[PDB]
């Protein structure tokens, strides 16, 4: 009985890590941050509505300049948006209309777009030739791609639907590091400001810490009861929040590897498709399937306000890198920007 | 505003015009979600490296058809099947020469019960409450020489019927068309075809014609 013995000792050391997480805690975040001043009503009206899509939008991403945002949809068009003046900077056609991820490079020279075709396409934006053309056809994933965040101008981290994350290159097109350890399809990804660790979200309610340089998990997060659909990373670098499909958002710890706080209400039932922070870290934007978003007081677990105004379900939202505004994409072919 | 901003918004207006004129093409494109069991006969209806969605296109009687096969995708179905709100109709290809052999690779269930589970999963979705089905029950030519040697009751202990073509075919129609929880919104269009038969593209055209008629009654406030 080798398999039974190894399984039972693996379960014993799983109870060991669970008891370590329990005994390391002393107090919850409620009874030490309930004595501070609450955040008032965050009444943020929409300012720019980036109309022009003719299909449902699954992905948007801001830039380091906090002015240009790109958006991917099932119209076959990847559109870069001048958010200040409501202007279409570019309209990148796609060889596959089935895309659910997009990312704008920190250098601003590249944009990613992938999806159900299981191929990551990276487009070179600022070229001497005046057009946008694809640079590399990143292939090797056996599942559907879900997130394609740019590590830098030369490395991209792509999470696919075959329980694997990967780190790619540009000059070669091969997989430098393959991440294994999930049992469900990965649906979210979020990098770090120091760019050394990234968290993932799979279909088995498991969130890991895949380091970049050597490429293995650091700790496992299993607190949700449904699949984790969206993930986002705290600006300090010691926390991250997950948005699952059971009307719960929850923070974690990069170093204490324990549950901090849950963000749920009796009214909200549907799941979360998009979650993001503010650059101060107190507001937690979260997009639901009730055709609206919400701002969450991360230190109080209190709904600080609603962001209603979208006709269809919001699937993607991100804030600017200077914390100026939040742009909430949705399935109504609209891009509302709130401030 | 500046002259550079004027040229920028002129470029944006040109991009909007291009988006309008190539989204105008999306009306004539009739999208079909072709899916089914592995080696269930879905290959023989499209005869007449991506490792993702197989993309094919054909036209007939001034109507553009795109068949969106997801047979090469082995991920969890429920987290990407919500992308197909705007599909015109669903192509469900299951064979009839599959009742006797159970899986031919593993031993858990039969092909017919797998088709039942797939059709039950695709019929009760929140995303597919109104999409019509052009369900194809193919490989009926090889079904009759396989129904004489082995009866249909070896997999169905509730049949108790005559072992022939018409009775087994009618029981197949009844057992595929009863899984719809709302027959007042979606009528399954069962059809028979073979490898060397006439064109079923006429039946496909009639079905998508009915779906387009339903959409035309929908958007004019008369449905």
């Amino acid at each position, epitope marked *: 009985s080798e398999l039974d013995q190894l399984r039972q000792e693996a379960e014993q050391l799983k109870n060991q890590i669970r008891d370590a997480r329990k005994a390391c805690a002393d107090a919850t975040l409620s009874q030490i941050t309930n004595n501070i001043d609450p955040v008032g009503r965050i009444q943020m009206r929409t300012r720019r509505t980036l109309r022009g899509h003719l299909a449902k939008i699954y992905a948007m991403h801001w830039g380091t300049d906090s*002015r*240009l945002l790109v958006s991917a949809s099932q119209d076959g068009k990847l559109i870069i948006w*001048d958010s200040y003046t409501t*202007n279409k*900077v*570019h309209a990148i056609p796609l060889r596959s209309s089935w895309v659910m991820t997009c990312a704008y490079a920190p250098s*601003g020279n590249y944009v990613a777009c992938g999806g159900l075709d299981n191929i990551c396409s990276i487009y070179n934006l*600022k070229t*001497r*030739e*005046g*057009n946008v053309r694809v640079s590399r056809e990143l292939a090797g994933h056996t599942g559907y791609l879900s997130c394609c965040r740019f590590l830098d101008d030369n490395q991209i981290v792509t999470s696919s639907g075959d329980t694997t994350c990967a780190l790619w290159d540009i000059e070669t097109g091969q997989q430098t590091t393959t991440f294994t350890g999930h049992t469900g399809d990965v649906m979210s990804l979020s990098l770090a400001p120091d760019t050394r660790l990234f968290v993932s979200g799979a279909c088995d309610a498991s969130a890991k810490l895949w380091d970049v340089r050597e490429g293995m998990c650091r700790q496992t997060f299993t607190g949700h009861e449904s699949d984790i659909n969206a993930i986002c990373f705290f600006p300090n670098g010691n926390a991250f929040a997950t948005g699952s499909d059971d009307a719960t958002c929850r923070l974690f710890d990069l170093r204490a590897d324990q549950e901090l706080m849950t963000y749920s209400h009796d009214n909200i039932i549907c799941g979360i498709t998009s979650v993001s922070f503010s650059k101060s870290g107190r507001l937690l934007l979260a997009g639901y399937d009730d055709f609206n978003c919400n701002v969450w007081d991360a230190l109080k677990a209190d709904r600080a306000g609603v962001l209603a105004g979208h006709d269809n379900r919001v699937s993607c939202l991100g804030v600017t890198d200077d914390g100026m505004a939040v742009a909430t994409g949705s399935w109504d072919s609209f891009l509302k920007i709130w401030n | *505003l*500046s*002259a*550079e*901003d*004027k*040229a*920028a918004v*002129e*470029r944006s*207006k*040109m991009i909007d015009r291009n988006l309008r004129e190539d989204g105008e093409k999306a009306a004539r494109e009739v999208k079909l979600l072709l899916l089914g069991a592995g080696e269930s006969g879905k290959n023989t209806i499209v005869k007449q490296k991506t490792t993702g969605i197989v993309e094919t296109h054909f036209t007939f009687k001034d109507l553009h058809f795109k068949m969106f096969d997801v047979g090469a995708q082995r991920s969890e179905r429920k987290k990407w099947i919500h992308c197909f709100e705007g599909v015109t109709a669903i192509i469900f290809c299951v064979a009839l020469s599959d009742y006797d052999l159970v899986l031919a690779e593993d031993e858990e269930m039969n092909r017919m019960h797998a088709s039942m589970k797939l059709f039950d999963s695709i019929c009760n979705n929140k995303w597919f409450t109104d999409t019509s089905i052009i369900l194809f029950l193919n490989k009926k030519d090889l079904f009759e020489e396989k129904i004489k040697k082995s009866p249909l009751t070896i997999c169905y202990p509730e049949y108790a019927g005559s072992n022939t073509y018409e009775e087994a075919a009618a029981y197949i129609q009844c057992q595929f068309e009863d899984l719809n929880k709302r027959k007042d919104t979606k009528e399954i269009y069962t059809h028979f075809t073979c490898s060397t038969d006439t064109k079923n593209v006429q039946f496909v055209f009639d079905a998508v014609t009915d779906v387009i008629i339903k959409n035309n009654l929908k958007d004019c406030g008369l449905f």
Partner: single-chain antibody, 232 residues
Framework: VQLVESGGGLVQPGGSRKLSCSAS????????MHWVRQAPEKGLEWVAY????????YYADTVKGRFTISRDDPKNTLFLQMTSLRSEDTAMYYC??????????????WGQGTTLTVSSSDIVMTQATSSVPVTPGESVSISCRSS???????????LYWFLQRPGQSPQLLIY???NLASGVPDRFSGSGSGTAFTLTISRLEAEDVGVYYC?????????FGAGTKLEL
């Protein structure tokens, strides 16, 4: 990227010609073309402008109603038709690409140029200095002056810097306040605020000599600066 001019030559006074540019090797349909001429005894002057897809047309005041500009996107050609041209139009004409969006670099590429010889409230830029004696490896800082302010409401200065090498086409050098074009080494620095404008070069090389020019892109027409040639 190629902008090869064609046609032209010696013409009788009061006649007509057709300046055609085979603008091939690049996406011609996404670039707003221009037309800049240069008198043999004077500097550069812009004469015409066509936007992408013939959306917007602008002309110089000297050639308005006398010059015809036209383009055809499938054939990748930019035309320039002049009728009853005067001896004041005796110059060599350059075709210029210009794309316009956020962060774009207008006036990026120029043509070789074909000579045209005739037989027998505008924001202007002034550069009084010319034929500046410089030494290689040293630092020089030329200056440029504008008639009015160039800081628009959207917080940027629309000033363009160029470099015309001897026997060569002008090249884009600095295309706003304090930013660098593509292919220019990280040596040419731009600065200045309001109407006082300047350039900055760290260590001059052998190919850095030539005549430098200014340009505003705030209102039309698009008149240049003066000669700012450098000498060894």
């Amino acid at each position: 990227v190629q902008l090869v001019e064609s046609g032209g030559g010696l013409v009788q006074p009061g006649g007509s010609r057709k300046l055609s540019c085979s603008a091939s090797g690049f996406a011609f349909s996404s670039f707003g073309m221009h037309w800049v001429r240069q008198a043999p005894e004077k500097g550069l002057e812009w004469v015409a402008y066509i936007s992408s897809g013939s959306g917007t047309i602008y002309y110089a005041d000297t050639v308005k109603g006398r010059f015809t500009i036209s383009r055809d996107d499938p054939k990748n050609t930019l035309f320039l038709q002049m009728t009853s041209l005067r001896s004041e139009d005796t110059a060599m004409y350059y075709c210029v690409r210009s794309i316009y969006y956020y962060g774009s670099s207008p006036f990026d590429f120029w043509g070789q140029g074909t000579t045209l010889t005739v037989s027998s409230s505008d924001i202007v830029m002034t550069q009084a200095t010319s034929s500046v004696p410089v030494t290689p490896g040293e630092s020089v800082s030329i200056s440029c002056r504008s008639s009015k302010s160039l800081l628009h409401s959207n917080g940027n200065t629309y000033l363009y810097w160029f470099l015309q090498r001897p026997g060569q086409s002008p090249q884009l050098l600095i295309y706003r306040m304090s930013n660098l074009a593509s292919g220019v080494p990280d040596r040419f620095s731009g600065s200045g605020s309001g109407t006082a404008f300047t350039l900055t070069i760290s260590r001059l090389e052998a190919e850095d000599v030539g005549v430098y020019y200014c340009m505003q892109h705030l209102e039309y027409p698009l008149t240049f600066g003066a000669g700012t040639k450098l000498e060894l």
